[PDB]
Amino acid sequence: AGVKTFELRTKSKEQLESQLVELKQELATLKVQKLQRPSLPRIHTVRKNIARVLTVINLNQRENVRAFYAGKKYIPKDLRAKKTRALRRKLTKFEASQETEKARKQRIAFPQRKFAIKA
Amino acid sequence: AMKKVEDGNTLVFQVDIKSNKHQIKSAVKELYDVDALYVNTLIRPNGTKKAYIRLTSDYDALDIANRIGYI
Amino acid sequence: GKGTPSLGKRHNKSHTLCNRCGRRSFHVQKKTCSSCGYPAAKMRSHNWALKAKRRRTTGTGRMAYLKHVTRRFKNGFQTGVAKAQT
Amino acid sequence: PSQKSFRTKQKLAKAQKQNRPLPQWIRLRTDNKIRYNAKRRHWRRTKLGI
RNA sequence: AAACUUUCAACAACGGAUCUCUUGGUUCUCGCAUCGAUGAAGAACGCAGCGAAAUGCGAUACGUAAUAUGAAUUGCAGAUAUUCGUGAAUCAUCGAAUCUUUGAACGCACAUUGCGCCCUCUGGUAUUCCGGAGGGCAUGCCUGUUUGAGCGUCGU
RNA sequence: AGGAAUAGUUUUCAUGCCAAGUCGUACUCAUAACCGCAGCAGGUCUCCAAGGUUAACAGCCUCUAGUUGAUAGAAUAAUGUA
RNA sequence: UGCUGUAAAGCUGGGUCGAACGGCCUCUAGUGCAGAUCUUGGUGGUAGUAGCAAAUAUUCAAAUGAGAACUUUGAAGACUGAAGUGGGGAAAGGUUCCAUGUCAACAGCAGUUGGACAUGGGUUAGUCGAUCCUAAGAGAUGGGGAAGCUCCGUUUCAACGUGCUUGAUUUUUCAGGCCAACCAUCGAAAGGGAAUCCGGUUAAAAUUCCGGAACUUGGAUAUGGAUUCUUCACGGCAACGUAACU
RNA sequence: GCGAGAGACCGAUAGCGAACAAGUACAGUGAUGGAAAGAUGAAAAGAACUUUGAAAAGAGAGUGAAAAAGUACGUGAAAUUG
RNA sequence: UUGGGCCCGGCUCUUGUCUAUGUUCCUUGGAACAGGACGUCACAGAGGGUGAGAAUCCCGUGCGAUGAGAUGACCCGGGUCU
Numbered sequence: 001a002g003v004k005t006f007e008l009r010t011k012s013k014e015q016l017e018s019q020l021v022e023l024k025q026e027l028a029t030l031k032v033q034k035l036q037r038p039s040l041p042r043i044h045t046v047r048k049n050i051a052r053v054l055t056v057i058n059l060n061q062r063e064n065v066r067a068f069y070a071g072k073k074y075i076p077k078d079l080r081a082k083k084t085r086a087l088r089r090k091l092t093k094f095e096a097s098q099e100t101e102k103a104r105k106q107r108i109a110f111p112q113r114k115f116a117i118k119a
Numbered sequence: 120a121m122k123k124v125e126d127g128n129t130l131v132f133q134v135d136i137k138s139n140k141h142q143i144k145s146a147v148k149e150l151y152d153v154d155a156l157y158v159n160t161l162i163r164p165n166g167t168k169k170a171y172i173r174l175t176s177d178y179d180a181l182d183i184a185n186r187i188g189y190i
Numbered sequence: 191g192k193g194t195p196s197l198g199k200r201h202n203k204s205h206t207l208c209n210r211c212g213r214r215s216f217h218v219q220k221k222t223c224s225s226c227g228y229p230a231a232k233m234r235s236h237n238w239a240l241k242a243k244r245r246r247t248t249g250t251g252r253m254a255y256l257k258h259v260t261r262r263f264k265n266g267f268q269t270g271v272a273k274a275q276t
Numbered sequence: 277p278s279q280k281s282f283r284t285k286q287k288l289a290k291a292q293k294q295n296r297p298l299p300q301w302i303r304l305r306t307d308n309k310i311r312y313n314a315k316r317r318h319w320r321r322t323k324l325g326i
Numbered sequence: 327a328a329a330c331u332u333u334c335a336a337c338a339a340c341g342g343a344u345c346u347c348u349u350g351g352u353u354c355u356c357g358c359a360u361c362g363a364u365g366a367a368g369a370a371c372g373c374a375g376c377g378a379a380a381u382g383c384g385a386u387a388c389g390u391a392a393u394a395u396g397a398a399u400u401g402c403a404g405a406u407a408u409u410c411g412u413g414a415a416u417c418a419u420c421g422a423a424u425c426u427u428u429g430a431a432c433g434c435a436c437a438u439u440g441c442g443c444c445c446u447c448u449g450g451u452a453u454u455c456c457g458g459a460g461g462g463c464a465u466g467c468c469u470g471u472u473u474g475a476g477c478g479u480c481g482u
Numbered sequence: 483a484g485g486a487a488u489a490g491u492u493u494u495c496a497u498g499c500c501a502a503g504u505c506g507u508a509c510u511c512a513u514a515a516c517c518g519c520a521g522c523a524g525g526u527c528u529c530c531a532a533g534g535u536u537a538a539c540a541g542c543c544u545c546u547a548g549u550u551g552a553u554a555g556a557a558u559a560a561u562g563u564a
Numbered sequence: 565u566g567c568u569g570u571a572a573a574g575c576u577g578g579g580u581c582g583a584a585c586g587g588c589c590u591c592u593a594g595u596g597c598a599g600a601u602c603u604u605g606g607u608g609g610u611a612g613u614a615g616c617a618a619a620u621a622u623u624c625a626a627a628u629g630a631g632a633a634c635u636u637u638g639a640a641g642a643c644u645g646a647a648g649u650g651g652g653g654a655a656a657g658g659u660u661c662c663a664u665g666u667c668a669a670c671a672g673c674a675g676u677u678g679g680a681c682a683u684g685g686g687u688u689a690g691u692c693g694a695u696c697c698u699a700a701g702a703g704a705u706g707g708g709g710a711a712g713c714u715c716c717g718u719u720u721c722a723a724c725g726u727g728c729u730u731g732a733u734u735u736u737u738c739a740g741g742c743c744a745a746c747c748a749u750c751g752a753a754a755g756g757g758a759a760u761c762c763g764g765u766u767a768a769a770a771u772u773c774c775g776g777a778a779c780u781u782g783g784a785u786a787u788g789g790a791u792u793c794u795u796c797a798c799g800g801c802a803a804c805g806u807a808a809c810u
Numbered sequence: 811g812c813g814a815g816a817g818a819c820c821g822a823u824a825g826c827g828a829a830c831a832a833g834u835a836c837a838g839u840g841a842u843g844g845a846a847a848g849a850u851g852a853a854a855a856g857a858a859c860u861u862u863g864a865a866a867a868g869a870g871a872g873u874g875a876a877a878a879a880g881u882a883c884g885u886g887a888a889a890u891u892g
Numbered sequence: 893u894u895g896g897g898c899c900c901g902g903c904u905c906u907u908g909u910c911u912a913u914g915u916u917c918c919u920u921g922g923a924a925c926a927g928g929a930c931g932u933c934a935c936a937g938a939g940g941g942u943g944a945g946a947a948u949c950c951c952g953u954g955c956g957a958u959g960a961g962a963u964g965a966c967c968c969g970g971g972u973c974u
């Protein structure tokens with residue numbers, strides 16, 4: 001089981017990094033006991049606890065940067081949408097919907113009529 | 120390795136393959152609060168790195184090894 | 191002496207390991223891999239050797255990124271997070 | 277040779293690691309097929325080609 | 327006459343045919359359009375309590391988050407793991423991340439784990455010398471900015 | 483270019499202080515660890531070099547060091563090989 | 565075990581065995597083997613046969629062990645004979661190294677032994693190499709070819725420094741003054757090249773560890789000495805000398 | 811490439827080279843070349859125990875519907891052999 | 893003849909939940925999924941699993957019902973302010 005992710009998200013940057021120090025110290029102690037016991041399933045729990053603390057720190061810091069760049073014209077490229085290389089080269093919705101006034105007048109003057117037959 | 124702990128005031132560790140002697144000395148100071156006289160390194164035939172860390176005369180390698188927990 | 195006696199004088203390697211394909215086909219003096227054509231930009235291949243294309247092609251490795259394009263395409267290339275059901 | 281590069285020695289360490297017999301507890305698993313390691317290598321029979 | 331040889335039968339061998347299947351192959355049809363400098367395909371090396379491979383993954387390493395779901399996993403062991411529950415197992419789902427050394431591969435170099443330079447922080451009595459952490463410095467081309475060059479040239 | 487007088491140098495004089503990263507390092511190197519399909523009478527670069535005889539680092543005997551490895555036993559016709 | 569058919573074949577008794585299969589009317593084909601120096605797999609006679617004969621050569625006893633021509637120890641007899649059958653290395657291999665255990669396969673007899681098999685251990689550097697330099701040569705770059713993959717050019721028809729030193733300023737700004745002929749980069753574990761020795765130590769590492777004694781390079785910087793009123797030292801006829809001595 | 815449904819197709823020397831840790835093992839300096847190999851049983855119930863032997867094994871016993879199924883494992887032809 | 897920005901729908905796409913009827917008796921067998929008897933459901937007697945040929949033991953199949961979330965200048969049914 002180990003540490004719970006929903007409780008980590010209530011903690012601050014200093015609490016998260018100090019809990020990280022405690023977990024690494026506890027993993028190092030287990031590797032010393034590994035030399036003699038020598039089967040410690042507990043190591044698996046502590047390893048995955050570190051991964052969770054490291055995950056929560058990184059996602060906490062990533063939302064600060066996202067809020068920092070919210071609405072900015074230029075944002076870091078790992079915060080941009082990553083669909084495919086070709087989709088990002090595609091014309092935007094505004095660019096693809098651009099129309100000359102000559103074409104706009106023609107479309108307004110002669111719209112596709114709605115009609116039926118036999119009456 | 121334990122003979123060297125007893126008989127040479129030297130501690131023997133497995134270390135990251137990417138570390139150099141400066142980083143290993145700093146690491147043992149930060150982790151175990153000891154002064155290394157020198158660090159001798161070695162890449163073992165299984166691809167892992169071994170460090171021979173002789174402490175200064177101000178420390179006792181046997182006592183540090185006891186406190187760490189493997190003797 | 192062109193057989194067994196001459197075969198005893200083989201101790202200088204013509205090829206060594208290639209950084210690109212890892213194959214021991216990197217010719218030492220020409221500095222070129224006879225297998226993948228490193229350090230040319232394009233990978234070496236020929237239509238007269240189809241079986242060589244089988245040995246090293248898309249899908250013979252991990253496909254660590256293309257593995258998930260089809261699943262991402264199905265979901266419309268979503269951005270955001272899943273929303274908990276209340 | 278004694279004078280060897282890092283890349284060569286790295287390749288040699290991996291070859292030693294893979295030159296081990298099957299762990300015995302493998303053969304006890306449900307629907308297990310492997311009974312021995314079919315990829316053993318001896319230094320004088322088959323060469324590493326590095 | 328025995329032994330020996332030869333023929334047949336019985337049983338036992340040798341060997342893997344036959345028969346019976348089949349998470350494979352092969353061919354046809356139907357539907358869909360989605361790789362990459364936002365670093366692909368491929369390569370190397372690692373990662374598990376006990377693993378060589380295959381499978382998966384990247385120092386957060388047989389995986390982290392999230393959503394769903396609802397009691398396993400299992401060869402053995404084991405909890406400071408769980409059961410009317412924020413909860414066992416789950417590449418079930420998947421939109422958030424991690425993603426070593428490389429590779430079109432981009433500081434230079436590469437049969438080397440070789441060699442610089444710049445910025446911020448930091449250790450050693452330090453703008454220089456030595457160490458550590460983080461972030462950078464490829465080429466071709468386009469638009470723009472700034473700094474310029476030429477009796478090419480206008481005017482004062 | 484910079485240096486004098488009640489004063490500037492120079493670590494090319496002595497002594498004193500601090501630091502020196504990365505990778506390799508076992509073993510074989512051959513009548514069995516390399517290449518010849520193999521523990522193959524083949525092939526594969528080089529350093530060290532004792533006493534006697536002698537022109538001689540040749541051949542023959544010996545010291546240090548190293549081996550005593552090459553299926554074995556009993557016989558001894560023909561024909562072989564040396 | 566028999567029966568039917570001229571025949572291709574069909575049916576049946578007994579034994580073995582364990583999951584599907586057949587008759588009739590039609591359809592369809594990757595439809596019938598003795599051969600192809602046929603293909604793949606398997607197996608004979610030959611035959612317990614040819615053979616296991618180069619490199620002088622072995623023997624007694626003890627130990628171990630179920631078992632000893634072949635292991636270990638002791639005692640002998642021999643040989644290599646320093647141009648070695650000795651002691652090291654380069655290339656190549658890659659754990660073969662060492663200890664412990666072990667003998668199914670392998671060591672063309674054997675095996676208690678092994679470079680075999682199994683489990684562990686083992687390779688420590690400022691001074692030894694690499695790393696750096698350039699050699700024959702290889703090769704980017706403004707470029708000139710080529711449809712192009714690419715070719716050619718490197719003393720390269722080019723506006724080619726990611727310059728250097730000061731008086732300092734910290735204002736992380738300045739200011740000057742020197743210059744730019746040459747120099748992308750790769751290319752040697754035998755060429756060139758900063759600096760380490762002795763003694764001891766392990767089952768297995770050592771110019772690397774321990775003990776002692778040194779050296780080189782880079783940096784910092786204090787003290788003493790030297791120098792200066794003839795400001796940047798004296799002496800020797802001289803060759804030249806010195807602790808220094810812009 | 812991705813997702814599906816089918817066949818008067820092949821049935822382990824066939825069908826893709828690969829039904830299996832298959833582009834694997836292995837070969838070549840290299841470009842490349844490239845195999846073999848599916849099936850105990852419903853369930854390991856994979857034979858406790860006694861005995862002979864240095865051991866491998868054997869003989870009893872046991873499990874199982876079957877050991878004429880013993881991880882040399884469905885059936886088990888022929889060549890060849892006792 | 894009249895433009896555009898917005899709200900709910902429809903359609904289109906992804907996706908959650910839900911469903912009939914024997915395991916009745918006899919015989920064989922290690923095992924009933926075999927045979928026999930009596931049945932049942934069937935818009936479901938496709939396919940698979942389970943100790944042998946299983947519509948009725950399990951999953952499914954067939955029939956529908958009911959939610960959620962996306963996406964569409966470039967599909968339309970309506971509102972709406974200009």
Ligand SMILES: CN[C@@H]1[C@@H](O)[C@@H](O[C@@H]2[C@@H](O)[C@H](O[C@H]3O[C@H]([C@@H](C)O)[C@@H](O)[C@H](O)[C@H]3N)[C@@H](N)C[C@H]2N)OC[C@]1(C)O
Nearest residue numbers: 706707708709716717718719720721722723724745746
């Ligand atoms: C007619 N146009 C010519 C143009 O062809 C060119 O002339 C080159 C000249 O530059 C070359 O000469 C040049 O290049 C050589 C190089 C090739 O080795 C150099 O050695 C030499 O110093 C240099 N001047 C000459 N060798 C040939 C002319 N056609 O440049 C000069 C020019 C007038 O523009």
Ligand SMILES: CN[C@@H]1[C@@H](O)[C@@H](O[C@@H]2[C@@H](O)[C@H](O[C@H]3O[C@H]([C@@H](C)O)[C@@H](O)[C@H](O)[C@H]3N)[C@@H](N)C[C@H]2N)OC[C@]1(C)O
Nearest residue numbers: 309311342343344822847848849881882883884885886
């Ligand atoms: C024990 N040896 C292993 C083993 O796995 C072996 O298996 C065969 C197995 O394939 C045979 O079984 C066979 O069954 C049929 C039929 C002809 O028997 C074959 O067509 C099929 O290929 C195969 N599965 C089996 N009868 C004997 C085992 N030793 O196959 C490989 C091997 C290395 O020889």
Ligand SMILES: [Zn+2]
Nearest residue numbers: 208211223226
């Ligand atoms: Zn290559």
